[PDB]
Design an enzyme around this catalytic site. Structure first.
Site, PDB file in Angstrom:
ATOM      1  N   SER A  61       0.938  -1.194  -0.093  1.00  0.00           N
ATOM      2  CA  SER A  61      -0.055   0.134   0.047  1.00  0.00           C
ATOM      3  C   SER A  61       0.748   1.482   0.092  1.00  0.00           C
ATOM      4  CB  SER A  61      -0.909   0.044   1.187  1.00  0.00           C
ATOM      5  OG  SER A  61      -2.076  -1.023   1.010  1.00  0.00           O
ATOM      6  N   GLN A 117     -10.996  -4.817  -0.220  1.00  0.00           N
ATOM      7  CA  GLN A 117     -10.516  -5.711  -1.382  1.00  0.00           C
ATOM      8  C   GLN A 117     -11.549  -5.642  -2.562  1.00  0.00           C
ATOM      9  OE1 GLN A 117     -11.307  -7.040   2.020  1.00  0.00           O
ATOM     10  NE2 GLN A 117      -9.526  -8.420   2.669  1.00  0.00           N
ATOM     11  N   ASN A 149      -8.781  -0.569  -1.254  1.00  0.00           N
ATOM     12  CA  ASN A 149      -7.945  -0.824  -2.426  1.00  0.00           C
ATOM     13  C   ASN A 149      -8.929  -0.656  -3.656  1.00  0.00           C
ATOM     14  OD1 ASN A 149      -5.752  -1.345  -0.985  1.00  0.00           O
ATOM     15  ND2 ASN A 149      -5.929  -3.675  -0.999  1.00  0.00           N
ATOM     16  N   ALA A 315       1.765  -3.028   3.209  1.00  0.00           N
ATOM     17  CA  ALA A 315       2.313  -4.296   3.362  1.00  0.00           C
ATOM     18  C   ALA A 315       1.518  -5.460   2.139  1.00  0.00           C
ATOM     19  CB  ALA A 315       1.553  -4.953   4.579  1.00  0.00           C
ATOM     20  N   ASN A 340       5.727  -8.951   6.703  1.00  0.00           N
ATOM     21  CA  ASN A 340       4.356  -8.287   7.255  1.00  0.00           C
ATOM     22  C   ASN A 340       4.517  -8.285   8.773  1.00  0.00           C
ATOM     23  OD1 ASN A 340       2.147  -6.814   7.622  1.00  0.00           O
ATOM     24  ND2 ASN A 340       1.056  -8.285   6.242  1.00  0.00           N
TER      25      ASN A 340
HETATM   26  O1  LIG Z   1      -1.445  -3.220   4.767  1.00  0.00           O
HETATM   27  C1  LIG Z   1      -1.589  -2.801   3.711  1.00  0.00           C
HETATM   28  O2  LIG Z   1      -0.964  -2.506   2.670  1.00  0.00           O
HETATM   29  C2  LIG Z   1      -3.018  -3.128   3.400  1.00  0.00           C
HETATM   30  C3  LIG Z   1      -3.679  -4.606   3.556  1.00  0.00           C
HETATM   31  C4  LIG Z   1      -4.909  -4.711   3.575  1.00  0.00           C
HETATM   32  C5  LIG Z   1      -5.459  -6.247   3.468  1.00  0.00           C
HETATM   33  C6  LIG Z   1      -5.934  -6.580   2.133  1.00  0.00           C
HETATM   34  C7  LIG Z   1      -6.116  -8.006   2.227  1.00  0.00           C
HETATM   35  C8  LIG Z   1      -6.128  -8.833   3.704  1.00  0.00           C
HETATM   36  C9  LIG Z   1      -6.036  -8.440   4.667  1.00  0.00           C
HETATM   37  C10 LIG Z   1      -5.970  -9.195   5.883  1.00  0.00           C
HETATM   38  C11 LIG Z   1      -5.627  -8.534   6.934  1.00  0.00           C
HETATM   39  C12 LIG Z   1      -5.219  -7.208   7.117  1.00  0.00           C
HETATM   40  C13 LIG Z   1      -5.162  -6.355   6.027  1.00  0.00           C
HETATM   41  C14 LIG Z   1      -5.576  -7.074   4.701  1.00  0.00           C
HETATM   42  N1  LIG Z   1      -3.052  -5.449   2.433  1.00  0.00           N
HETATM   43  C15 LIG Z   1      -3.176  -5.236   1.113  1.00  0.00           C
HETATM   44  O3  LIG Z   1      -3.767  -4.325   0.658  1.00  0.00           O
HETATM   45  C16 LIG Z   1      -2.615  -6.285   0.222  1.00  0.00           C
HETATM   46  C17 LIG Z   1      -2.569  -6.478  -0.844  1.00  0.00           C
HETATM   47  C18 LIG Z   1      -1.982  -7.853  -1.588  1.00  0.00           C
HETATM   48  C19 LIG Z   1      -1.613  -8.786  -0.629  1.00  0.00           C
HETATM   49  C20 LIG Z   1      -0.940 -10.018  -1.253  1.00  0.00           C
HETATM   50  O4  LIG Z   1       0.061 -10.430  -0.355  1.00  0.00           O
HETATM   51  O5  LIG Z   1      -1.521 -10.539  -2.077  1.00  0.00           O
HETATM   52  C21 LIG Z   1      -1.724  -8.422   0.897  1.00  0.00           C
HETATM   53  C22 LIG Z   1      -2.329  -7.170   1.248  1.00  0.00           C
HETATM   54  C23 LIG Z   1      -2.664  -6.607   2.552  1.00  0.00           C
HETATM   55  O6  LIG Z   1      -2.254  -7.299   3.522  1.00  0.00           O
END
Ligand SMILES: O=C(O)C[C@@H](Cc1cccc2ccccc12)N1C(=O)c2ccc(C(=O)O)cc2C1=O
Length: 358
Positions: A61, A117, A149, A315, A340
């Protein structure tokens, strides 16, 4: 490097890595406009490849900051206006709930409850249309912020439509190339594959998976050097020679909405400096950061404030990143890790470092 920088960085980061079991990490401190780099551990544990200044990390992000500035650049080019209805750029989007939902709302997560998402099931352009058409808001536009997102992702896709460029081509030509971010990618090329760190989740090596509107919301990979230069560029946009890019950076740090003591920009989030560290640290927790919160409209938006803490957490499954800077102080930090680990630990370490150098 100056011993002060060396000592604060190592004393803060070493225990962080130990506590959080971070496999690999890169840190940049920008101090009086100049970068200082630090690295630890492994980009690839199995192949014993160390983290270097050339290692690519998934920004997750933190990518939204690039999206915001690219949108800003389009505003400055006269190609879009944040006041424009979403429907202006997507004529197939006919469902009446979109009446009154503008590019501003998409960019700032205030459309009325677009989800965090895009569903995994959404693959095609027809799937995406169906998804947005069928989406029903919880709230009137411009009343609640819900980090999403699906919100800023759509903003990114629409902001580049008038140019006729793909989102990736637009970003390359209009942001990365002018700023000489020559090792920053939406899609990592074969030439850079040797430098692309593995992310680690529950001990397994992982990279981000493809998904709809991924580039726009969470899809950028970068090095510590390019990210330091990204911080420099946002710290001091008047040094940027390309006029529309300069204005675009400025617009991304304008203050559009306030919730609690945070202000929403385009990608960037801001608080007044000096900050209450407890507020930024506690506020970064996904408990708060991902929560729906009422917003106060800033009418009209405040131009970028120099005395700000400007930041973004981000993340993916296997990576954790944080960027923060203080324009007034010509001070900034980038922390990239291939795990993460919890947001508050990132912000606490960043605060401790910047506070000591301020
Ligand atoms: O911290 C961020 O940037 C935002 C978080 C928002 C998010 C998206 C999807 C599942 C999640 C589960 C727990 C917490 C945040 C999550 N995020 C995401 O925006 C995001 C996009 C892609 C992936 C992947 O590994 O495919 C993982 C994440 C991800 O953890």
């Amino acid at each position: 490097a100056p011993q002060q920088i060396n000592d604060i960085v190592h004393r803060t980061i070493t225990p962080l890595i130990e506590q959080q079991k971070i496999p690999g990490m890169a840190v940049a401190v920008i101090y009086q406009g100049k970068p200082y780099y630090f690295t630890w551990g492994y980009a690839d544990i199995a192949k014993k490849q160390p983290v270097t200044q050339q290692t690519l990390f998934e920004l997750g992000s933190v990518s939204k900051t690039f999206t915001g500035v690219l949108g800003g650049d389009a505003i400055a080019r006269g190609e879009i206006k944040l006041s424009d209805p979403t429907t202006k750029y997507w004529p197939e989007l006919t469902a009446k709930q979109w009446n009154g939902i503008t590019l501003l709302h998409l960019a700032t997560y205030t459309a009325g409850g677009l989800p965090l998402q895009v569903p995994d099931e959404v693959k095609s352009s027809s799937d995406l249309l169906r998804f947005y058409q069928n989406w029903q808001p919880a709230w009137a536009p411009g009343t609640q912020r819900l980090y999403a997102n699906s919100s800023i992702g759509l903003f990114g896709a629409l902001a580049v439509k008038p140019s006729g460029l793909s989102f990736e081509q637009a970003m390359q030509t209009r942001v990365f190339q002018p700023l000489k971010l020559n090792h920053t990618w939406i899609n990592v090329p074969p030439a850079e594959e040797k430098n692309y760190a593995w992310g680690y989740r529950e001990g397994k090596a992982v990279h981000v998976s493809p998904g709809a509107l991924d580039a726009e919301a969470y899809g950028v990979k970068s090095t510590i050097e390019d990210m330091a230069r990204w911080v420099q560029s946002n710290l001091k946009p008047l040094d940027i020679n390309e006029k529309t890019l300069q204005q675009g950076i400025q617009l991304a740090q304008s203050r559009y909405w306030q919730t609690g003591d945070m202000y929403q920009g385009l990608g960037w989030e801001m608080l007044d400096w000096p900050v209450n560290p407890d507020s930024i640290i506690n506020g970064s927790d996904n408990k708060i950061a991902l929560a729906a919160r009422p917003v106060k409209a800033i009418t009209p938006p405040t131009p970028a404030v120099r005395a700000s803490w400007v930041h973004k957490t981000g993340a993916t499954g296997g990576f954790g990143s944080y960027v923060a800077f203080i324009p007034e102080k010509e001070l900034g930090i980038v922390m990239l890790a291939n795990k993460n680990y919890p947001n508050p630990a990132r912000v606490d370490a960043a605060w401790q470092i910047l506070n000591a150098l301020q």
